[PDB]
């Protein structure tokens, strides 16, 4: 039926998956034990969880996700958490050695002996699955263990399974903030390896997520819990169509076909409109008009891209909550009449609308608003090439002085692959203005 498998690689990529399942267990009312109250929802595993959980005759909801990590610190810590009884022990794939922020080390040194093990997990998850539309990969570009290990497995899952979708989600590198100068090494390495295999790569940057907090949420000192809550809300919003229904029901396959215009470039941008504080929700009103203004307001994008420096191709708005087509179709028509939003003349229409009746809910101990009407804005624009333009002039200098190469050439690697990525990259920019040029 309508199910998918979620993947969580990198110890920074696992707490985000932890929060999402925590967020996910609320709307279905999942008790931490693993069972509902005396209310009858258990069976062979066929209800709203069947797309997310596996609550068999045993009665315990089994999430259809696998947590893989190379360092046992965090994974054992969450193995001592609150829902660890829910979690299947050995799909919390732990590791005994790290990749040391090296793409190749996680891609070559240790990834070989572990992928076969997780290959057993996925097939034994594949056999129990029925329709399995696609995959949900949580990772990071500057992955100490996210980068290298994911790259090998996505190669392996691509070659054996090329008939289904693969959905990619990684934190985009901070353009001006760097916790590691080796991040440009592995990040472009990951991109050039993934461009010909990845289906839909979705990125995000924390700085503007931080910038949002003290702008409208008015939080000058948030925490990851808030950060993980926001992204968990994002994936929850896109996965509600699997959970519930709406005026029309959309799917990732529609997302794939309609969002990516041309091969290679498959990197749209998400956004959430009713990002507002609780108090602001109280003494104000939300409607399609202003949130449509807010969703297309440039400062509301978590990626430091300026739309007037680029041009628009696609816009996917997923309206979750109580909306009517009347104001929605009228409001977007006004947007089509707006002059500043410069869609490319190639696409007369670039709007993929999704309506869902279920109101977006709050989380206990949370910080979001009491949303009646929400929308997720999956859009792709040409103002993103500056990010790769930023990366290369960072990369071109450091490669010219070939710093830290002794580490990578010391562990058996060479410069030819490093050479590939730069013209591979240069191919990406040169195409971007080619499609950018009308």
């Amino acid at each position: 039926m309508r199910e998918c498998i979620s993947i969580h690689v990198g110890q920074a990529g696992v707490q985000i998956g932890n929060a999402c399942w925590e967020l996910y267990c609320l709307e279905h009312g999942i008790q931490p034990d693993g069972q509902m109250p005396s209310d009858k929802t258990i069976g062979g595993g066929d209800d709203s969880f069947n797309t997310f959980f596996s609550e068999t005759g045993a009665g315990k909801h089994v999430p259809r996700a696998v947590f893989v990590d190379l360092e046992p610190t965090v994974v054992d810590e969450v193995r001592t958490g609150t829902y660890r009884q829910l979690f299947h022990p050995e799909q919390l794939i732990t590791g005994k050695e790290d990749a040391a922020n090296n793409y190749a080390r996680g891609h070559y040194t240790i990834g070989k002996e572990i992928v076969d093990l997780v290959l057993d997990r996925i097939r034994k998850l594949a056999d129990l699955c029925t329709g399995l539309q696609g995959f949900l990969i949580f990772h990071s570009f500057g992955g100490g263990t996210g980068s290298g290990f994911a790259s090998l497995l996505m190669e392996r899952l691509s070659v054996d399974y090329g008939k289904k979708s693969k959905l990619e989600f990684a934190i985009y590198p901070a353009p001006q903030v760097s916790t590691a100068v080796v991040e440009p090494y592995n990040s472009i390495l990951t991109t050039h390896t993934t461009l010909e295999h990845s289906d839909c790569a979705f990125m995000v940057d924390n700085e503007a997520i931080y910038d949002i907090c003290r702008r409208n949420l008015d939080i000058e000192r948030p925490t990851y819990t808030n950060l993980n809550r926001l992204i968990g809300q994002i994936v929850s919003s896109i996965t509600a169509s699997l959970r519930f229904d709406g005026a029309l029901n959309v799917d990732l396959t529609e997302f794939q076909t309609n969002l990516v215009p041309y091969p290679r470039i498959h990197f749209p941008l998400a956004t959430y409109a009713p990002v507002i504080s609780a108090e602001k929700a109280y003494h104000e009103q939300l409607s399609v008009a202003e949130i449509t203004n807010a969703c297309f307001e440039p400062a509301n994008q978590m990626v430091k891209c300026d739309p007037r420096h680029g041009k628009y191709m696609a816009c996917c708005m997923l309206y979750r909550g109580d909306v009517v087509p009347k104001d929605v179709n009228a409001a977007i028509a006004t947007i089509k009449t707006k002059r500043t939003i410069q869609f490319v003349d190639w696409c007369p229409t670039g709007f993929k609308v999704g309506i869902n009746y279920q109101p977006p809910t709050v989380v206990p101990g949370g910080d979001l608003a009491k949303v009646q009407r929400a929308v997720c804005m999956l859009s792709n624009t040409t103002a993103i090439a500056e990010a790769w333009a930023r990366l290369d002039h960072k990369f071109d200098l450091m490669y010219a002085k070939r710093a830290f190469v002794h580490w990578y050439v010391g562990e058996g690697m060479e410069e030819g692959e490093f050479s590939e990525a730069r013209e591979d990259l240069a191919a990406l920019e040169k195409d971007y203005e080619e499609v950018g040029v009308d």
């Binding site: 932890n18 958490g81 008015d218 819990t225 101990g365």
Partner: protein, 49 residues
Amino acid sequence: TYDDHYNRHNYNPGLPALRTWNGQKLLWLPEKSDFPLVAPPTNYGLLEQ
């Protein structure tokens, strides 16, 4: 930190709406810079066994 935010469900004796028009920054503030510190932190069952 995981125990606090996830397991302990954060600070109980705190007043929920401890965030409103303040002094220097005359706006929503006095919510959390203190953070919980109380209650048995290191008391899971595997230690005693």
